């Protein structure tokens, strides 16, 4: 059960909070036929395109609201397991980034997953790829995970698109 | 393959490079029948276990030794994947800590997997956990790999012990 609402572009923008560039920072695109064999499931039919570089779109997910109460998270720990899906466009590279944080209530960084940003060298193609991570052993007061991704922000133009991106996921563990 | 040595305590502390406490500050045991159901390939045999809830240990990969090739390295940039397994002891708080980094030819770090700290819950148990991560994406340059664990090096004695570690890997995928 993907707490994350609108993955892949089916529900157009809608649910994602999005960066200074707005609206037109991004477009959801149909995959080719080709594409929607890189995903497990046949149920990864769309994807997010930022329109410039640095674009990025985040969702802040509310645990108690989804069912995982204060007492299951500090007592129990379940896994957390957030997943995404980036590439790049045929013909150049591109960059990418993911942010997720574990929010207390009143918002501090309990934990986070921020690896170095991706560099998507330039191909004929662009293979869809797959970041993964998993929180356990947290500890107390995880009520919010925030889950950003898009392109790196830098005022620095240097050659690089920003990504595409589709199939985010954020769920706990049985 | 895996790229480190003696992942699991058969040749003792071998291989490995101790902190300020040497060899004083690990142990090898046996695992019991049960507690090796809990690994996949049923090869895991023993573990190594903090003497001192500070106590750390390193290794690292020169890739070129390895047979990984500048080319291979700065051009493909292959997956290269680490996993780890550490738990606690039954009845008492452990923590954790794992950092691996991507090193160039000199030493900056070009990558890096630094988790926050886990925090084992005392229990009347010590189920092994594994963490897992992929290295993809990570541009040109990388040479040396550095793969360190044990418990949090914190001046600050706060009940936590330190945790039980092995079945470490790091391997370059085909």
Same mark, same amino acid.
């Given at each position: 059960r993907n707490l994350l609402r609108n993955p892949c572009g089916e529900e157009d923008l809608e =649910?994602?909070?999005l960066d200074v560039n707005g609206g037109d920072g991004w477009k959801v695109e149909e995959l080719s036929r080709d594409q929607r064999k890189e995903f497990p499931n046949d149920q990864v039919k769309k994807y997010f395109v930022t329109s410039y570089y640095t674009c990025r779109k /985040? %969702?802040? !997910?509310? *645990? %108690?609201?989804? =069912?995982?109460?204060?007492? *299951? *998270?500090? $007592? $129990? %720990?379940? /896994? !957390? +397991?957030?997943?995404?899906?980036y590439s790049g466009r045929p013909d150049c590279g591109s960059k990418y980034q993911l942010t997720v944080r574990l929010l207390s209530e009143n918002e501090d960084v309990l934990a986070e @997953?921020?690896?170095?940003?991706?560099?998507? %060298?330039? #191909?004929?193609?662009? #293979?869809?790829?797959? !970041?993964?991570? $998993?929180? !356990?052993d947290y500890g107390? =007061? +995880?009520? @919010? +995970?925030? @889950?950003?991704?898009?392109?790196?922000?830098?005022?620095?133009? /240097?050659?690089?698109? =920003?990504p595409r991106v589709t199939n985010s996921s954020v769920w706990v563990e049985p």
């Open positions: =649910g994602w909070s /985040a %969702q802040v !997910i509310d *645990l %108690q609201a989804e =069912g995982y109460w204060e007492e *299951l *998270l500090d $007592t $129990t %720990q379940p /896994a !957390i +397991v957030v997943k995404d899906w @997953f921020q690896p170095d940003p991706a560099t998507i %060298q330039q #191909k004929s193609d662009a #293979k869809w790829r797959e !970041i993964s991570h $998993t929180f !356990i107390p =007061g +995880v009520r @919010f +995970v925030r @889950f950003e991704h898009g392109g790196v922000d830098t005022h620095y133009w /240097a050659g690089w698109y =920003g």
